[PDB]
Scaffold this motif. Structure first.
Motif, PDB file in Angstrom:
ATOM      1  N   UNK A   1      41.014  89.328  50.653  1.00  0.00           N
ATOM      2  CA  UNK A   1      42.172  90.164  50.360  1.00  0.00           C
ATOM      3  C   UNK A   1      42.514  91.064  51.545  1.00  0.00           C
ATOM      4  N   UNK A   2      41.523  91.305  52.399  1.00  0.00           N
ATOM      5  CA  UNK A   2      41.706  92.129  53.591  1.00  0.00           C
ATOM      6  C   UNK A   2      41.116  91.443  54.818  1.00  0.00           C
ATOM      7  N   UNK A   3      41.369  92.026  55.985  1.00  0.00           N
ATOM      8  CA  UNK A   3      40.886  91.478  57.246  1.00  0.00           C
ATOM      9  C   UNK A   3      40.779  92.578  58.298  1.00  0.00           C
ATOM     10  N   UNK A   4      39.566  92.792  58.801  1.00  0.00           N
ATOM     11  CA  UNK A   4      39.318  93.825  59.800  1.00  0.00           C
ATOM     12  C   UNK A   4      39.619  93.313  61.205  1.00  0.00           C
ATOM     13  N   UNK A   5      40.501  94.020  61.907  1.00  0.00           N
ATOM     14  CA  UNK A   5      40.896  93.650  63.263  1.00  0.00           C
ATOM     15  C   UNK A   5      40.674  94.804  64.237  1.00  0.00           C
ATOM     16  N   UNK A   6      40.345  94.463  65.481  1.00  0.00           N
ATOM     17  CA  UNK A   6      40.277  95.436  66.567  1.00  0.00           C
ATOM     18  C   UNK A   6      41.532  95.342  67.432  1.00  0.00           C
ATOM     19  N   UNK A   7      42.390  96.355  67.348  1.00  0.00           N
ATOM     20  CA  UNK A   7      43.608  96.399  68.158  1.00  0.00           C
ATOM     21  C   UNK A   7      43.271  96.559  69.635  1.00  0.00           C
ATOM     22  N   UNK A   8      44.308  96.618  70.464  1.00  0.00           N
ATOM     23  CA  UNK A   8      44.135  96.924  71.876  1.00  0.00           C
ATOM     24  C   UNK A   8      43.618  98.353  72.005  1.00  0.00           C
ATOM     25  N   UNK A   9      43.987  99.191  71.036  1.00  0.00           N
ATOM     26  CA  UNK A   9      43.505 100.570  70.965  1.00  0.00           C
ATOM     27  C   UNK A   9      43.104 100.972  69.546  1.00  0.00           C
ATOM     28  N   UNK A  10      41.897 100.578  69.144  1.00  0.00           N
ATOM     29  CA  UNK A  10      41.353 100.946  67.848  1.00  0.00           C
ATOM     30  C   UNK A  10      41.357  99.806  66.855  1.00  0.00           C
ATOM     31  N   UNK A  11      40.907 100.102  65.640  1.00  0.00           N
ATOM     32  CA  UNK A  11      40.729  99.086  64.612  1.00  0.00           C
ATOM     33  C   UNK A  11      41.244  99.537  63.256  1.00  0.00           C
ATOM     34  N   UNK A  12      41.513  98.552  62.402  1.00  0.00           N
ATOM     35  CA  UNK A  12      41.975  98.778  61.033  1.00  0.00           C
ATOM     36  C   UNK A  12      41.731  97.561  60.131  1.00  0.00           C
ATOM     37  N   UNK A  13      41.583  97.806  58.829  1.00  0.00           N
ATOM     38  CA  UNK A  13      41.499  96.730  57.841  1.00  0.00           C
ATOM     39  C   UNK A  13      42.895  96.256  57.459  1.00  0.00           C
ATOM     40  N   UNK A  14      43.340  95.197  58.127  1.00  0.00           N
ATOM     41  CA  UNK A  14      44.682  94.663  57.943  1.00  0.00           C
ATOM     42  C   UNK A  14      44.839  94.095  56.541  1.00  0.00           C
ATOM     43  N   UNK A  15      45.814  94.614  55.802  1.00  0.00           N
ATOM     44  CA  UNK A  15      46.151  94.060  54.499  1.00  0.00           C
ATOM     45  C   UNK A  15      46.633  92.627  54.686  1.00  0.00           C
ATOM     46  N   UNK A  16      46.124  91.719  53.859  1.00  0.00           N
ATOM     47  CA  UNK A  16      46.375  90.293  54.041  1.00  0.00           C
ATOM     48  C   UNK A  16      46.613  89.575  52.718  1.00  0.00           C
ATOM     49  N   UNK A  17      47.500  88.584  52.762  1.00  0.00           N
ATOM     50  CA  UNK A  17      47.730  87.685  51.642  1.00  0.00           C
ATOM     51  C   UNK A  17      46.863  86.433  51.796  1.00  0.00           C
ATOM     52  N   UNK A  18      45.867  86.248  50.905  1.00  0.00           N
ATOM     53  CA  UNK A  18      44.940  85.112  51.027  1.00  0.00           C
ATOM     54  C   UNK A  18      45.620  83.744  51.120  1.00  0.00           C
ATOM     55  N   UNK A  19      46.893  83.667  50.745  1.00  0.00           N
ATOM     56  CA  UNK A  19      47.643  82.419  50.839  1.00  0.00           C
ATOM     57  C   UNK A  19      48.278  82.279  52.220  1.00  0.00           C
ATOM     58  N   UNK A  20      48.933  83.346  52.673  1.00  0.00           N
ATOM     59  CA  UNK A  20      49.591  83.366  53.976  1.00  0.00           C
ATOM     60  C   UNK A  20      48.895  84.335  54.924  1.00  0.00           C
ATOM     61  N   UNK A  21      47.780  83.896  55.497  1.00  0.00           N
ATOM     62  CA  UNK A  21      47.020  84.717  56.430  1.00  0.00           C
ATOM     63  C   UNK A  21      47.828  84.941  57.709  1.00  0.00           C
ATOM     64  N   UNK A  22      47.477  85.981  58.487  1.00  0.00           N
ATOM     65  CA  UNK A  22      48.202  86.285  59.729  1.00  0.00           C
ATOM     66  C   UNK A  22      48.276  85.084  60.676  1.00  0.00           C
ATOM     67  N   UNK A  23      49.381  84.944  61.434  1.00  0.00           N
ATOM     68  CA  UNK A  23      49.519  83.782  62.322  1.00  0.00           C
ATOM     69  C   UNK A  23      48.422  83.705  63.382  1.00  0.00           C
ATOM     70  N   UNK A  24      47.709  82.585  63.427  1.00  0.00           N
ATOM     71  CA  UNK A  24      46.681  82.380  64.441  1.00  0.00           C
ATOM     72  C   UNK A  24      47.292  82.338  65.833  1.00  0.00           C
ATOM     73  N   UNK A  25      46.573  82.892  66.802  1.00  0.00           N
ATOM     74  CA  UNK A  25      46.998  82.843  68.191  1.00  0.00           C
ATOM     75  C   UNK A  25      46.515  81.563  68.862  1.00  0.00           C
ATOM     76  N   UNK A  26      47.313  81.054  69.793  1.00  0.00           N
ATOM     77  CA  UNK A  26      46.956  79.857  70.543  1.00  0.00           C
ATOM     78  C   UNK A  26      46.066  80.201  71.735  1.00  0.00           C
ATOM     79  N   UNK A  27      45.274  79.228  72.212  1.00  0.00           N
ATOM     80  CA  UNK A  27      44.440  79.456  73.396  1.00  0.00           C
ATOM     81  C   UNK A  27      45.273  79.646  74.659  1.00  0.00           C
ATOM     82  N   UNK A  28      44.931  80.647  75.463  1.00  0.00           N
ATOM     83  CA  UNK A  28      45.639  80.902  76.712  1.00  0.00           C
ATOM     84  C   UNK A  28      45.549  79.711  77.661  1.00  0.00           C
ATOM     85  N   UNK A  29      46.644  79.465  78.372  1.00  0.00           N
ATOM     86  CA  UNK A  29      46.705  78.435  79.403  1.00  0.00           C
ATOM     87  C   UNK A  29      47.340  79.059  80.644  1.00  0.00           C
TER      88      UNK A  29
END
Ligand SMILES: Nc1ncnc2c1ncn2[C@@H]1O[C@H](COP(=O)(O)OP(=O)(O)O)[C@@H](O)[C@H]1O
Ligand code: VO4
Ligand SMILES: [Mg+2]
Length: 705
Positions: A35-63
């Motif tokens: 139901x939640x997801x803990x993330x570390x921002x560029x400056x600090x952290x927070x428990x990101x509210x999340x929808x278990x069906x539509x999770x936050x968009x995954x990032x692609x690998x840098x090229x």
């Protein structure tokens, strides 16, 4: 399922940010299914509210460099597209990026040395995708298909005002002209048609210093050896009010300023011109110079281009005479006499030049600028005009003269580009005015934006409707890609009960008014059609939900601009002109502007539908004409409007290469089990009701031949 296993430590996701639309955030601890997801921002952290069906968009690998084609993205979503384009633009200085066959072009607002002849020929003979993305590649691909399939093609560029459509269209035409050379030099003339129409058809707006105020479709004709032999230009409603009106910081059409900047040249003295600041028709915006543009130098280039097209000095002077006459007409003094009457002096210095140049009687013009004739059967009545009415009649005449002049130039360009041979095929290049909105929007913007809706419809019909239907009828497994169908707003504008039909109705009333028309719009559509709104604080405007934005339109002047008339006595005077070119304009050889426009777009859409389209989607990266400056909020708004994400999804999922043709080229139970037992990959090709779809899996068999 496995989805949760992808959201782990060290992994990154995209989360909403006001400024950059999306911001990156690193996962601190692995995710638990449901139901939640803990993330570390560029400056600090927070428990990101999340929808278990539509999770936050995954990032692609840098090229090292953003992928040339967006279909290559593992995680295909809006943040990925926005980020890949940002990296390719801001850092790598790459303006072009593929979305399959569809090209995305970012306006650099900076000259780039990537359009030379050497580069043109490097793209020639190459396959789409072999080279880096480029407008030339789109142009080569259309050329390749025309020759190989003997099928007509279209280059269709889109985007809002100043996104770079005209520039893209011209570079596509330059490519064609170069690879067709050496013709036995028709190519030079086809290219010359653009800058001429720019001089008489483009003007500075606050969105674009070189805004196209007309639509253009140029059919480039080829012979059987695929060499250019000629061309034909179709134009779509020119902005006439531009001739007699400009808002702050906007200009009239370029050629007026090219002419005024040449006022003190010997050849032009007889036109009795002064600076652009002398004339009401060119001074109104408050600034007659475009940064970086030398209007005198442009006049010289315009003259060279006329000459290149075979228009000699006398032909040039004749159009300059018309243009000078229009300028002088705008400075004819109309004075108030009491409250009900107006007057023009026959000795008005500007009236005399106007009449000298067009060979008219000054007593007649002065008379019928300030009076109108009413002919019944019982009698003929002459009523005085108020000064406002006289000014309006005066300006209407100016607009009409310019409209004829523009059509005349186009017609003569088309005569110069004719061919005696047979047209084997053609490639059509579409360049129309793009979506635009200002503090004050009127009939002009309504028409332009309606035209852009129709183009988005033509794009959608081809990319989403026709394409996905083919799969469903061929009965293969296909997951549908959703797109925004803009048919509703189109119907609201063009259909039987639509805004334009209601405008035409009000125009038939002899006592019709903008206000009465507006009320009929309110009554028919407020709280009834969702795409129509009335601002809470206005009884003079209405709002439309266009595909790209909401636009507020002021009702004032819609009837007048839709009728587009000049008083008969004024037309009669110019019809009796002693100047040959002017008499030709007003010679005697019902429907409204809005209705002519609808019909013109209908014919254009079906012209395009009978060709193989090649789409270029232009994006204006910022609103300040800054070099390689990435405005995230404005760019994502344009990506959404053009359905870029959906275009990439269907692009990635589509089968590029499409039974009776299968056997002869190189029952249906045999051909399938033959190819199946031929290639070990059952996914590498999907079989349908009457055709087998190959995922570049089709190219392998080709080289085996
Ligand atoms: N590829 C490009 N290279 C350099 N400048 C460009 C390019 N595309 C657009 N521009 C700049 O942006 C301006 C407006 O582009 P334009 O094609 O005229 O817009 P529109 O889409 O309204 O037709 C160009 O006249 C030029 O100043
Ligand atoms: O500003 V452009 O009208 O040429 O779209
Ligand atoms: Mg343009």
């Amino acid at each position: 399922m496995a989805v949760a296993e992808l959201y782990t430590q060290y992994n990154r996701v995209w989360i909403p940010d006001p400024e950059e639309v999306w911001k990156s955030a690193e996962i601190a601890k692995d995710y638990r299914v449901g139901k939640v997801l803990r993330l570390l921002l560029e400056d600090g952290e927070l428990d990101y509210s999340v929808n278990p069906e539509s999770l936050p968009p995954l990032r692609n690998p840098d090229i090292l460099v953003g992928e040339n084609d967006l279909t290559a993205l593992s995680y295909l979503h809006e943040p990925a597209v926005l980020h890949n384009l940002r990296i390719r633009f801001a850092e790598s200085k790459l303006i072009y990026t593929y979305s399959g066959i569809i090209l995305v072009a970012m306006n650099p607002y900076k000259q780039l040395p990537i359009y030379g002849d050497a580069i043109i020929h490097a793209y020639s003979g190459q396959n789409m995708g072999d080279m880096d993305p480029h407008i030339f590649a789109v142009a080569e691909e259309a050329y390749k298909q025309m020759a190989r399939n003997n099928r007509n093609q279209s280059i269709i560029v889109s985007g809002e005002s100043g996104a770079g459509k005209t520039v893209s269209a011209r570079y596509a035409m330059r490519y064609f002209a170069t690879v067709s050379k050496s013709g036995s030099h028709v190519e030079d003339k086809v290219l010359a048609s653009n800058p001429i129409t720019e001089a008489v058809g483009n003007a500075k707006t606050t969105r674009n210093d070189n805004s196209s105020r007309f639509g253009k479709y140029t059919e480039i004709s080829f012979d059987e050896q695929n060499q250019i032999i000629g061309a034909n230009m179709s134009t779509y409603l020119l902005e006439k009010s531009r001739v007699v009106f400009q808002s702050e910081n906007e200009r009239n059409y370029h050629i007026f300023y090219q002419l005024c900047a040449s006022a003190q040249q010997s050849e032009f003295k007889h036109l009795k011109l002064g600076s652009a600041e002398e004339f009401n028709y060119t001074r109104m915006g408050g600034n007659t110079v475009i940064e970086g543009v030398n209007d005198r130098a442009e006049m010289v280039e315009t003259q060279k281009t006329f000459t290149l097209l075979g228009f000699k000095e006398d032909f040039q002077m004749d159009v300059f005479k018309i243009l000078a006459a229009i300028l002088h007409l705008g400075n004819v003094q109309i004075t108030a006499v009491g409250n009900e009457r107006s007057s023009v002096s026959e000795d008005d210095s500007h009236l005399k030049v106007f009449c000298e140049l067009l060979g008219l009687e000054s007593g007649r013009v002065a008379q019928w600028l300030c009076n109108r004739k009413i002919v019944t059967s019982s009698e003929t009545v002459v009523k005085p005009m108020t000064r406002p009415q006289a000014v309006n009649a005066r300006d209407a005449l100016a607009k009409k003269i310019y409209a004829h002049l523009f059509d005349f130039i186009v017609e003569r360009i088309n005569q110069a580009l004719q061919f005696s041979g047979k047209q084997h095929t053609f490639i059509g290049v579409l360049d129309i005015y793009g979506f635009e909105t200002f503090d004050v929007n009127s009939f002009e913007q309504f028409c332009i934006n309606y035209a852009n809706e129709k183009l988005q419809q033509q794009f959608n019909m081809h990319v989403f409707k026709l394409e996905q239907e083919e799969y469903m009828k061929e009965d293969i497994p296909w997951t549908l890609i959703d797109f925004y169908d803009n048919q509703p707003v189109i119907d609201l504008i063009e259909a039987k009960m639509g805004i334009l039909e209601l405008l035409d109705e009000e125009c038939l009333l002899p006592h019709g008014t903008d206000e009465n028309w507006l009320q009929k719009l309110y009554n028919n559509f407020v709280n009834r059609n969702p795409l129509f709104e009335k601002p809470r604080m206005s009884n003079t405007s209405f709002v439309i939900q266009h595909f790209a934005d909401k636009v507020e339109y002021k009702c004032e002047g819609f009837l007048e601009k839709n009728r587009d008339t000049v008083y008969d006595m004024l037309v009669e005077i110019l019809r009796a002109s002693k100047f040959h070119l002017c008499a030709n304009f007003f010679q005697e050889n019902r429907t409204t502007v809005g209705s002519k426009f609808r019909s013109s777009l209908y014919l254009l859409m079906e012209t395009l539908n009978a060709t193989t389209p090649h789409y270029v989607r232009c994006i204006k990266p910022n609103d300040e004409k800054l070099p390689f400056e990435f405005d995230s909020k404005r760019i994502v708004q344009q990506l959404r409007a053009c359905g870029v994400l959906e275009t990439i999804r269907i692009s990635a999922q589509s089968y590029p290469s499409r039974y009776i043709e299968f056997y002869s080229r190189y029952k249906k139970e045999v051909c399938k089990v033959v190819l199946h037992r031929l290639i070990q990959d059952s996914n590498q090709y999907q079989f349908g009701k009457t055709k087998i779809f190959f995922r570049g899996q089709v190219a392998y068999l080709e080289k085996l031949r």
